[PDB]
Design a protein around this ligand. Structure first.
Ligand SMILES: NC(=O)c1ccc[n+]([C@@H]2O[C@H](COP(=O)([O-])OP(=O)(O)OC[C@H]3O[C@@H](n4cnc5c(N)ncnc54)[C@H](OP(=O)(O)O)[C@@H]3O)[C@@H](O)[C@H]2O)c1
Ligand SMILES: COc1ccc2c(C(=S)N(C)CC(=O)O)cccc2c1C(F)(F)F
Length: 315
């Protein structure tokens, strides 16, 4: 309704601001506007290369006494080059310093795929194929657990793990803490109800990323279906006197999923928060669900031959 609750007890705000593709020079004002409207959850990642500028906006708000740290849910993610057990605490610490924080509320393994460690975030080989490393995410998970032990993060989770990969963690001998969250792509064209159902039966909250199907993604070829311009969802939105964006954000909320839409435009950030005031009647919910095309915006074919590439599995 307003926040879901993690198995730790922690209240996770159901709406958050996304920061991927939000440019360094715009994301500080975007984060400030968002906290001024009442957003209390920011979704970040080291690979978005803007955590420093996110941090600046947070800092201004925290020292300006506009929010208490306890009222903020800040998420970041461990990038693929940092999956070797020994690189994890370093990567978490760099993210804390950039964000100008003492702890994270949630730290996610960003993708199940470990890439060759080094300065370059996407180490490529001759064939333009990404270079794997010598690690298994169950080892990365152990290092992610030590972050909880030390108080650097309040909960750990995963992102883009298929249900068999989540199982690998859950069935790990010696497991201290289990995935509190699994953040995955969920929108009308990829409604994901089997992975959602699986996660929920395991007690793992789901965060639906790319609610509007990422119009601004780099690889957006012009003959790709725009959820925002899909006349069908414009129609259901018209009935609602709301926008396609607003009903596209309402949809995950209603399915009891955390939503993190991205915008750097102030007006749009304010629009995206104007959604806790209407409900979609079950017909609409089911029509939105019937748009399931299994169309996946974040497919990342360049990674497909990786041993832990998540999407060759049904769910
Ligand atoms: N864990 C992962 O692997 C992963 C992967 C992808 C995304 N995510 C997270 O999910 C967040 C959201 O997904 P996304 O950024 O991929 O895409 P998205 O939220 O589906 O789409 C963002 C695009 O839609 C626009 N938009 C936002 N509000 C709008 C509105 N009210 N009206 C019209 N258009 C609007 C934004 O415009 P402007 O910004 O130009 O205003 C931007 O161009 C990301 O920022 C990231 O934090 C996580
Ligand atoms: C695991 O492989 C990934 C993961 C993420 C990306 C991204 C990113 S940062 N996203 C799709 C957003 C995100 O992962 O949060 C962009 C380009 C290539 C990627 C790749 C890849 F390079 F292979 F295509």
């Amino acid at each position: 309704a307003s926040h879901l609750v993690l198995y730790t007890g922690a209240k996770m705000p159901i709406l958050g601001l996304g920061t991927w593709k939000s440019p360094p020079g715009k994301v500080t004002e975007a984060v400030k506007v968002a906290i001024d409207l009442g957003y209390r959850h920011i979704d970040c990642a080291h690979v978005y290369q803007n955590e420093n500028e996110v941090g600046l906006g947070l800092q201004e708000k925290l020292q300006g006494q506009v929010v208490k740290r306890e009222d903020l849910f800040i998420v970041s993610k461990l990038w693929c080059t940092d999956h070797e057990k020994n690189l994890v605490k370093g990567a978490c610490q760099t993210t804390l310093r950039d964000l100008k924080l003492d702890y994270l509320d949630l730290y996610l393994i960003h993708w199940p795929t470990g890439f060759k460690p080094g300065k370059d975030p996407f180490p490529l080989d001759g064939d333009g194929n990404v270079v794997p490393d010598e690690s298994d995410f169950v080892e990365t998970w152990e290092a992610m657990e030590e972050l909880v032990d030390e108080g650097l993060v309040k909960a750990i989770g995963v992102s883009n793990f298929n249900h068999l990969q989540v199982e690998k963690i859950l069935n790990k001998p010696g497991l201290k803490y289990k995935p509190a969250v699994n953040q995955i792509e969920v929108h009308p064209y990829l409604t994901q109800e089997k992975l959602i159902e699986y996660c929920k039966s395991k007690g793992i909250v789901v965060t639906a990323y790319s609610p509007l199907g990422s119009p601004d993604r780099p690889w957006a070829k012009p003959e790709d279906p725009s959820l925002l311009e899909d006349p069908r969802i414009k129609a259901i939105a018209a009935k609602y006197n709301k926008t396609t964006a607003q009903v596209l954000i309402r949809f995950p909320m209603q399915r009891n999923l955390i939503v993190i839409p991205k915008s750097v435009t102030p007006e749009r950030i304010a629009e995206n928060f104007q959604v806790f005031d209407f409900e979609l009647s079950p017909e609409d919910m089911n029509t939105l669900l019937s748009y399931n095309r299994n169309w996946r915006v974040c497919a990342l074919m360049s990674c497909a031959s990786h041993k832990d590439y998540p999407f060759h599995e049904e769910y």
